[PDB]
Design an enzyme around this catalytic site. Structure first.
Site, PDB file in Angstrom:
ATOM      1  N   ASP A  29     -27.001   8.214   1.450  1.00  0.00           N
ATOM      2  CA  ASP A  29     -27.297   9.167   2.514  1.00  0.00           C
ATOM      3  C   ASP A  29     -28.164   8.448   3.542  1.00  0.00           C
ATOM      4  OD1 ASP A  29     -27.943  11.245   4.202  1.00  0.00           O
ATOM      5  OD2 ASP A  29     -28.547  12.628   2.613  1.00  0.00           O
ATOM      6  N   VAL A  30     -27.757   8.518   4.810  1.00  0.00           N
ATOM      7  CA  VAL A  30     -28.435   7.811   5.884  1.00  0.00           C
ATOM      8  C   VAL A  30     -29.846   8.335   6.130  1.00  0.00           C
ATOM      9  CG1 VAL A  30     -27.386   9.354   7.587  1.00  0.00           C
ATOM     10  CG2 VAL A  30     -28.124   7.048   8.293  1.00  0.00           C
ATOM     11  N   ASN A  56     -22.333   3.995  12.834  1.00  0.00           N
ATOM     12  CA  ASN A  56     -21.541   5.121  13.307  1.00  0.00           C
ATOM     13  C   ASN A  56     -22.033   6.437  12.708  1.00  0.00           C
ATOM     14  OD1 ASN A  56     -19.538   6.810  14.293  1.00  0.00           O
ATOM     15  ND2 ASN A  56     -17.833   5.712  13.347  1.00  0.00           N
ATOM     16  N   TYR A 127     -29.007  16.188  19.569  1.00  0.00           N
ATOM     17  CA  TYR A 127     -27.938  15.197  19.581  1.00  0.00           C
ATOM     18  C   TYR A 127     -27.984  14.363  20.852  1.00  0.00           C
ATOM     19  CZ  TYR A 127     -23.236  13.214  19.076  1.00  0.00           C
ATOM     20  OH  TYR A 127     -22.164  12.360  18.979  1.00  0.00           O
ATOM     21  N   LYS A 131     -28.862  10.429  21.065  1.00  0.00           N
ATOM     22  CA  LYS A 131     -27.793   9.543  21.506  1.00  0.00           C
ATOM     23  C   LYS A 131     -28.271   8.669  22.660  1.00  0.00           C
ATOM     24  CE  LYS A 131     -23.951   9.484  19.242  1.00  0.00           C
ATOM     25  NZ  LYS A 131     -23.844   9.830  17.796  1.00  0.00           N
TER      26      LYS A 131
END
Lengths: 152, 152, 152
Positions: A29-30, A56, A127, A131
């Site tokens: 899990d990241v 990614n 998000y 990003k």
């Protein structure tokens, strides 16, 4: 399933010993730094020095209003989308600068913005900010990581 | 006998002897592997052996072609039923190209076959490079600029 | 006149020191016929099959034990390789070993002046042994070396 289909394609297209060309390190899990270190050590043991780092992994986020967003979700989104990038960059940079070559590619999104031009994206502030943070990290570490290591 | 351009008779006698040796050796290893499989022991698959003839070459590029096929038979999954493989006296069987080879473009050819492209200012520099490199990709190029000598 | 053995071109087991020099002898016979044509000495080769003898029976049994097969399978296979039937002592047609008398008659044919126009030819006293004369090809296409991986 993905590994099986990939190795089937590799065997079809003429490659030899597909089992030594595609490994899996699932269950990582990241969101955990320790799991990131475990992934790094697994990849190093499996194939040695790693040239390409394709970051990614990224989730949608809290999926709420800014005024309806708990701080814990904010932290989780930052850890998954922003912090992990620099973590993996830190762990994989020493080898790439030791061998004199390397490339890290971070998967950004159009809905996060651009240099000198921002883009709103409602319900999804986390998000977008994460990003754009990824994009900024690339654009600013290009100078220091060069000329041995590429970032994009 | 990589030796060429002279004709050899001892080469022919060696070729016959080695070919018979390869035939009998393959039969031996094959039945031995079936014996091992019947015994259930995990034993190496049958020894696969072959011969590569060269004397039948008049050209210069025969040695590189023979080495390439040697590596091909050594490393890939390819099998050839016949034991003896001769080289044609003149390599006019697959285009030409000298060293074909692979280097500097094989991922490029065929990507734009069937297209027609008109490029302006293709006398030198980026225009010449793009025109040439797209021409290698399979399209038809219409080089337009001022100086006739550079264009030709 | 040199008496070679047909098993110089067959799957003849466990007997490299027996089969390889005879194939080399056939090649030497062809080349010696070529060279002695100038000096005017006729050269001829004969390929007698399994001749009726105790030694060939012991050879067949030895091949049977060394293959791990029941006795008579070698005889059955090489008799299946035949085409012809000869009348036995009772006048019945059967597949059997060629006799020494046939080889002697063929040899006295080759030696005498009746075979003047023959040079470097091969005659088989085999009752129709159908075996591959040779296994040869040519390499008429270049190698695909892109997909080859030779690690380790």
């Amino acid at each position: 399933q993905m590994q099986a289909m990939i190795q089937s394609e590799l065997a079809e297209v003429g490659y030899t010993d597909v089992e030594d060309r595609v490994h899996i390190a699932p269950g990582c899990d990241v969101s955990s730094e320790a799991q990131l270190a475990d992934l790094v050590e697994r990849t190093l043991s499996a194939f040695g020095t790693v040239d390409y780092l394709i970051n990614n992994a990224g989730i949608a986020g809290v999926e709420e209003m800014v005024i309806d967003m708990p701080v814990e979700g904010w932290r989780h989104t930052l850890f998954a989308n922003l912090i992990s990038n620099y973590s993996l960059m830190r762990k994989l940079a020493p080898l790439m600068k030791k061998q004199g070559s390397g490339y890290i590619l971070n998967v950004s999104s159009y809905f996060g913005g651009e240099k000198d031009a921002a883009i709103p994206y409602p319900n999804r502030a986390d998000y977008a900010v994460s990003k754009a943070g990824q994009r900024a990290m690339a654009e600013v570490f290009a100078r220091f990581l060069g000329p041995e290591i590429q970032i994009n | 006998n990589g030796a060429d351009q002279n004709g050899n008779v001892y080469g022919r006698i060696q070729s016959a002897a080695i070919g018979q040796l390869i035939r009998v050796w393959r039969h031996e290893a094959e039945l031995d592997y079936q014996r091992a499989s019947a015994a259930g022991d995990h034993v190496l698959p049958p020894v696969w052996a072959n011969q590569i003839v060269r004397f039948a070459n008049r050209s210069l590029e025969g040695l590189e072609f023979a080495c390439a096929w040697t590596a091909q038979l050594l490393h890939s999954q390819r099998h050839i039923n016949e034991i003896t493989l001769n080289i044609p006296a003149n390599i006019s069987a697959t285009t030409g190209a000298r060293s074909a080879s692979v280097g500097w473009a094989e991922s490029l050819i065929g990507l734009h076959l069937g297209k027609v492209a008109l490029i302006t200012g293709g006398s030198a520099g980026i225009g010449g490079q793009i025109g040439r490199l797209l021409a290698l990709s399979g399209a038809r190029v219409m080089l337009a600029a001022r100086d006739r000598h550079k264009l030709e | 006149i040199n008496v070679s053995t047909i098993f110089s071109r067959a799957e003849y087991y466990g007997r490299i020191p027996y089969v390889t020099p005879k194939a080399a002898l056939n090649a030497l016979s062809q080349l010696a016929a070529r060279e002695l044509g100038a000096r005017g000495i006729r050269v001829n080769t004969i390929f007698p099959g399994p001749i009726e003898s105790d030694r060939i029976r012991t050879v067949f049994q030895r091949m049977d034990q060394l293959k791990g097969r029941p006795e008579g399978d070698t005889a059955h296979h090489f008799l299946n390789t035949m085409r012809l039937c000869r009348a036995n002592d009772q006048g019945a047609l059967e597949r059997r070993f060629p006799s020494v008398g046939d080889v002697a008659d063929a040899a006295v044919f080759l030696a005498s002046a009746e075979s003047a126009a023959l040079s470097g030819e091969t005659i088989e006293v085999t009752h129709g042994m159908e075996l591959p004369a040779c296994s040869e090809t040519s390499l008429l296409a270049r190698t695909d070396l892109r997909t080859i991986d030779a690690s380790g």
